[PDB]
RNA sequence: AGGACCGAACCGACUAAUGUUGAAAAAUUAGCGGAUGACUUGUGGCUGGGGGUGAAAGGCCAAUCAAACCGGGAGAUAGCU
RNA sequence: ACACAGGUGGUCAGGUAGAGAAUACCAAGGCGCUUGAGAGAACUCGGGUGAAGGAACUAGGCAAAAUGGUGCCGUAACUUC
RNA sequence: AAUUCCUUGUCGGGUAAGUUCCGACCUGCACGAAUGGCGUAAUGAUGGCCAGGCUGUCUCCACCCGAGACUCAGUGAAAU
RNA sequence: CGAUGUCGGCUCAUCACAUCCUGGGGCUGAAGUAGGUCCCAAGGGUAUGGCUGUUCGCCAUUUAAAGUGGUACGCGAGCUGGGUUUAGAACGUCGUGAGACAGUUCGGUCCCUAUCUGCCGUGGGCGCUGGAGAACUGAGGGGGGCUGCUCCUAGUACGAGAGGACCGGAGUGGACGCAUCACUGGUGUUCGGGUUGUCAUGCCAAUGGCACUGCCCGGUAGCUAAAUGCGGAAGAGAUAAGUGCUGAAAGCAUCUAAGCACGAAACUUGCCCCGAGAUGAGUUCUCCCUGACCCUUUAAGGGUCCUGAAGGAACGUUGAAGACGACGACGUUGAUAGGCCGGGUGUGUAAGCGCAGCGAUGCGUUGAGCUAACCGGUACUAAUGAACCGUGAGGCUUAACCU
């Protein structure tokens, strides 16, 4: 069964995972740094990191893209204005993910994820 | 259900004399603070391998 | 990196059949039959064309009255003389496998407006 | 492909239009067949055109397959279904007065010498 | 019998006129250098060792540091030792040449097969499948009964059950030769080999072919 | 004009799988029968142990039944365990 | 037995899709539920793809599945009509 | 034959092979006239048999999606 | 008898043989084709369905064969439950009846949370006589075995008549075991297009969730068999059954006794695989370690003060690998994974804008827009420090030799 799969199976149904990472990416463009579990922090890189490359063009051929997920005006207020154009001469690598230890009072794995350039 | 023997102190001694799961060997510190941490994570005041990655 | 490319280019032809599925053709073979070599010809519509190099199968379907006869030729192989086009066609979805289920008026396969 | 209960189609005159496989044979423990196999076959529906009767068990030789063949000239030949030429129960080889379509260019050689008079396409 | 160490580099087709595609595997041999020969009066051996090291020098094992630095200059990889009597090769000789196959009809391959992990006892040992109908259950992917009633009560070494499938170096004992180049370490052979480009391959002259 | 044909609510609990020291002290999943009536359901009453109830099966009558439950006879009796 | 995959007389029973007080998803109004963080091997239950076909399976098409709506055209045997 | 010992009755129909089923045979061990006879119809979770439609029952599996098992942290059983 | 589950089939085993097939011979009323008949040899092999509770059977079709037995007629904590060994009755026969049949047909029930003696898998530890790293020898053993059809032989020899060969040489099938995704299909949710129902994004626009992946399509990487291949070598050694020469027991005679040639598919090796826990712990490639004071009839050690090598672990990034271990690729002495770039490959001409079209919708701009797993390039993000483990020249005796 299964063979190659690089993405994590995590927990609960696929629509739960979808509506978790959709909302958590909204929280990431709201605070630019998140405290969470190592599996969540490392899977949050998907689609959101290449969305910075998508947004670098400021073009009309891309104008109907990158608003399929996280559909709150919080993202399209930054998209093609600074979200994208702030990394447009770096050539890749827009997110950093590192581990912080264990959740306080148990053993669940803790981490953090950030955007590499952020106003605070 | 079936039982031929109730395991003696000496029989269970082979599970209570040489087994391993942890050793807490030496641990890690930064030159800024002697409050010990594990080998590959960030501390609560933001220290990690000389790179001090988050400040508040 | 591919380091057998020079051994694949020993079989592969520099002239690649390149016209998309739905063109109506005539394909020629030598048969050889030990000691009875003769140029033999098959007619139909091309239902598979390009692009996996030496693996490209090249499939043709006769679409004859009450007869769906089908052949796979491998144009890079030593057993094919020629391929020639007599009519244009037009597809814009999939590698034409529906020409098993389409017949007659449904086998007209457009004309590339040519 | 080509197994017990499989339906095949006609290839010769006075042969039947619905014929069924019951034995693949031609070797030990065989269950699947291709072109040039000889099948133990039953007439499953009998018609006024056929010189045959329902439930009569005979032999037939495979000339069309839905999997196809590449042995003849080195390029695949594949058909809409599976078809076989009916064989003579007494004196072996085909018994039909005419064969339909191209068929196989083997059904005319020194193991089928009664058949050289017919006019299929190959 | 001696052999060459290498890898698969791809697959090709050469065709027949009658005809079919004819699959031809492409093999390349590397680092058959030789650094040790074992003979005379001790422990019954007569053998030659190829020592196939090619590793990044920045991570070489401490036992292998200074061990090829005078001859061979590269470490890591399989050592590989083959039986050889009275051919008179030395550690100051020349690397084993794939010209060994210039008049050879067919070759014998030993090489790491595709991994399957645990796979299954019926998938590995080809047992006859019990029907999953009329109320039969828990009988469809199992090795079946592991011994006999009353008397033995100890299990026989003839019964097979769990382990790992694939990764065995196997026996593919007849591949007919198609082309060889000793100036380019290149070998072409008719048919399939075990594994892929991430594997290892050994090739010897054939014996039951 | 429906002891009409099909089919929801409403009633039943026939079929297959699951569960079987269970999540459930027979429950769940999907079918299936009946569904204006020899149909169904709320309330208070009446029928009680050889007596009820039963268009009848040793079916049913409070986790108890070829004679239920509870106080006494009772420490029944035994060419017997 | 309980902060129990449970049971439950009578009322109002919105909008949109629909044959539907089926199922679906939008008001009014409500919720994300006191074990949950990883892993998604063996192993289990439930659900859903696929070629040629084809009952060849099996005592037995049990189960499983195609089919499934509506308007119109059409409708055999036998018959006590 | 819901009753013909044992015997696929004996023969024909349908099947590739039919102890089941369809039709006959009379010479019924133990059919037989309201503890009915025989035919039959509307109804039938009734008993048995055929064919097509269709199909993962099967060739032979190949596979994928949930929710448990599997590992930890707080709490923590049993039959024997 | 204070519970020894039963017949039938499936599935998995194990040992013999009075030999079915294959292999080796003899006889014959054995030309030859067969057949009829008897041991030589158990080395290799030895069915699919119907009706039926059946094993037992009576039938349809295959095959090189459809051999014969043992083990509670082996295998229900490995399977169903047809038959039967749970109530039900039914029709016929019998009892006056409560009921039953040298009666049949039909309805009806099948457990586990696997502990230990065990087996599989995997890690740790002890030892091989200091401390380690990596290969090898083989005390022993398992695996392989047989086998179709066609053409030449062959219409000859032989045979009233009908017919009709031996052998080594080729072609062509099929597969137990084993390899692979190529051939040719299928599937491919991770790539892209078409589309129904509903809700929503302030609205427009066209986009997204959800409904068997809601519906229909191709397709990579991959998976796979419903696909294709390869392999049961010759030799060496000594035999079995058997063929001979020369020649004795028992002065003839004789393949057996001495001598001598020749003898099987099996046996011992070769072919393929396994293996030093082989207290009998083997070899090689090599690598490193050269402490002390106080005390003991003291090669053992006890206390204390000093000093650390070879080489490992921890820490990790990760995949063609994998339950977990482990295995291969990698940790700036850097392309292991992510981002980025370009190739490679798939899908099908985006949205906007204009125009044509009563309008729906198309067409151009435009081979357009988008593109995963395969590959190269690019360090843009990410792959702990001294600390830990493990030393400080290794026991007795025989001998050599320098003080």
Curated annotation (Swiss-Prot), chain A:
UniProt cross-references to InterPro entries, sorted A to Z: Ribosomal_bL17, Ribosomal_bL17_CS, Ribosomal_bL17_sf
One Gene Ontology term, aspect cellular component: cytosol
Quaternary structure and interacting proteins, as annotated: Part of the 50S ribosomal subunit. Contacts protein L32.
Gene Ontology MF annotations: structural constituent of ribosome
Keyword match Repeat: no
Keyword hit for rRNA-binding: no
Listed GO biological process terms: cytoplasmic translation; ribosomal large subunit assembly
Function: Requires L15 for assembly into the 50S subunit.
Gene: rplQ
Gene source species: Escherichia coli (strain K12)
Family, per entry: Belongs to the bacterial ribosomal protein bL17 family.
Protein name per its UniProtKB record: Large ribosomal subunit protein bL17
Keywords: Ribonucleoprotein, Ribosomal protein
Swiss-Prot record, chain B:
Claim: Electron transport is one of the keywords in the record: no
Keyword set includes Ribosomal protein: yes
Molecular function terms, GO-annotated: structural constituent of ribosome
GO term, biological process aspect, one: response to radiation
Region feature (Disordered): 1-37
Entry GO CC: cytoplasm; cytosol; cytosolic large ribosomal subunit
Key words, A-Z: Ribonucleoprotein, Ribosomal protein
HAMAP family registered for this protein in UniProt: Ribosomal_bL32
Family statement drawn from the similarity comment of this UniProt entry: Belongs to the bacterial ribosomal protein bL32 family.
Quaternary structure note: Part of the 50S ribosomal subunit. Contacts L17.
Name of the featured protein: Large ribosomal subunit protein bL32
Species of the source: Escherichia coli (strain K12)
Encoding gene, per UniProt annotation: rpmF
Curated annotation (Swiss-Prot), chain D:
One BP term from GO: cytoplasmic translation
Keywords: Ribonucleoprotein, Ribosomal protein, RNA-binding, rRNA-binding
One GO term describing the cellular component: cytoplasm
Pfam families: Ribosomal_L14
GO MF annotations in UniProt: large ribosomal subunit rRNA binding; structural constituent of ribosome
Record InterPro entries: Ribosomal_uL14, Ribosomal_uL14_bac-type, Ribosomal_uL14_CS, Ribosomal_uL14_sf
Superkingdom to which the source organism belongs: Bacteria
Oligomeric form and interacting partners: Part of the 50S ribosomal subunit. Forms a cluster with proteins L3 and L19. Forms two bridges to the 30S subunit in the 70S ribosome, contacting the 16S rRNA. In pre-50S ribosomal subunits interacts with RsfS, which may inhibit association with the 30S subunit.
Function recorded in the entry: Binds to 23S rRNA. Forms part of two intersubunit bridges in the 70S ribosome. In the 3.5 A resolved structures L14 and L19 interact and together make contact with the 16S rRNA in bridges B5 and B8.
Family membership noted in the UniProt record: Belongs to the universal ribosomal protein uL14 family.
Protein name (database record): Large ribosomal subunit protein uL14
Swiss-Prot record, chain E:
Statement: the UniProt record of this protein carries the keyword Membrane: no
GO molecular function: rRNA binding; structural constituent of ribosome
Gene3D superfamilies: 3.30.160.810, Translation factors
Family (UniProt): Belongs to the universal ribosomal protein uL3 family.
Subunit note: Part of the 50S ribosomal subunit. Forms a cluster with proteins L14 and L19. In pull-down experiments interacts with CedA.
Family matches, as PANTHER family: 50S RIBOSOMAL PROTEIN L3, LARGE RIBOSOMAL SUBUNIT PROTEIN UL3C
Name listed for the protein in its UniProt record: Large ribosomal subunit protein uL3
């Amino acid at each position: 069964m299964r063979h190659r799969k690089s993405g994590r199976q995590l927990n609960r149904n696929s629509s739960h995972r979808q509506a978790m990472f959709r909302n958590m990416a909204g929280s990431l463009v709201r605070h630019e740094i998140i405290k969470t579990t190592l599996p969540k922090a490392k899977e949050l890189r998907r689609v959101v990191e290449p969305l910075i490359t998508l947004a670098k063009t400021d073009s009309v051929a891309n104008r109907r893209l990158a608003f399929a997920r996280t559909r709150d005006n919080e993202i399209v207020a930054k998209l093609f204005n600074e979200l994208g154009p702030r990394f447009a001469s770096r050539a890749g690598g827009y997110t950093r993910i590192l581990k912080c230890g264990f959740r306080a009072g148990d053993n669940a794995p803790m981490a953090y994820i950030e955007l590499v350039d952020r106003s605070e | 259900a079936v039982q031929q023997n109730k395991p003696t102190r000496s029989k269970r001694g082979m599970r209570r004399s040489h087994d391993a799961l942890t050793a807490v060997t030496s641990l890690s510190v930064d030159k800024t603070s002697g409050e010990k941490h594990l080998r590959h994570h960030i501390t609560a005041d933001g220290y990690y391998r000389g790179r001090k990655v988050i400040a508040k | 990196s591919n380091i057998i490319k020079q051994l694949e280019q020993e079989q592969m032809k520099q002239d690649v059949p390149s016209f998309r599925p739905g063109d109506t053709v005539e394909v020629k073979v030598w048969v050889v039959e030990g000691s009875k070599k003769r140029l033999q010809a098959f007619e139909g519509v091309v239902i598979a064309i390009r692009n996996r190099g030496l693996h490209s199968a090249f499939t043709v379907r006769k679409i004859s009255n009450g007869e769906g006869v089908e052949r796979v030729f491998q144009t890079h192989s030593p057993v094919v003389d020629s391929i020639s086009v007599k009519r244009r066609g037009a597809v814009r979805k999939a590698k034409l496998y529906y020409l098993r289920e389409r017949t007659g008026k449904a086998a007209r396969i457009k004309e590339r407006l040519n | 492909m080509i197994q017990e209960q499989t339906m095949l189609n006609v290839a010769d005159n006075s042969g039947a239009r619905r014929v069924m496989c019951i034995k693949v044979l031609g070797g030990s423990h065989r269950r699947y067949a291709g072109v040039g196999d000889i099948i133990k076959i039953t007439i499953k529906e009998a018609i006024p055109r056929g010189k045959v009767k329902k439930g009569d068990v005979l032999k037939a030789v495979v000339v069309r397959t839905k999997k196809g063949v590449r042995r003849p000239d080195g390029s695949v030949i594949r058909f809409d279904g599976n078809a076989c030429v009916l064989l003579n129960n007494n004196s072996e080889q085909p018994i039909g007065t005419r064969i339909f379509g191209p068929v196989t260019r083997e059904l005319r050689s020194e193991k089928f010498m009664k058949i050289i008079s017919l006019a299929p396409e190959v | 019998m001696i052999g060459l160490v290498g890898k698969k580099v791809g697959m090709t087709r050469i065709f027949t006129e009658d005809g079919v595609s004819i699959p031809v595997t492409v093999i390349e041999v590397e680092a058959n250098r030789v650094t040790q020969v074992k003979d005379l009066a001790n422990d019954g051996y007569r053998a030659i060792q190829v020592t196939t090291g090619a590793k990044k020098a920045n991570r070489v094992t401490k036992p292998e540091a200074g061990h090829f630095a005078k001859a061979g200059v590269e470490a890591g990889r399989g050592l590989w030792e083959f039986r050889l009597a009275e051919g008179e090769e030395f550690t100051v000789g020349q690397s084993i040449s794939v010209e060994l196959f210039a008049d050879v009809k067919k070759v014998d391959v030993t090489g790491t097969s595709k991994g399957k992990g645990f796979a299954g006892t019926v998938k590995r040992w080809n047992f006859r499948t019990q029907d999953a109908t009329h109320g039969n259950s828990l009988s469809h992917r199992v090795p079946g009964s592991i011994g006999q009633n009353q008397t033995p009560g100890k299990v026989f070494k003839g019964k097979k059950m769990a382990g790992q499938m694939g990764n065995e170096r196997v026996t593919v004992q007849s591949l007919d030769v198609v082309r060889v180049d000793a100036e380019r370490n290149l070998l072409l052979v008719k048919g399939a080999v075990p594994g892929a480009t991430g594997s290892d391959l050994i090739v010897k002259p054939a014996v039951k072919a």
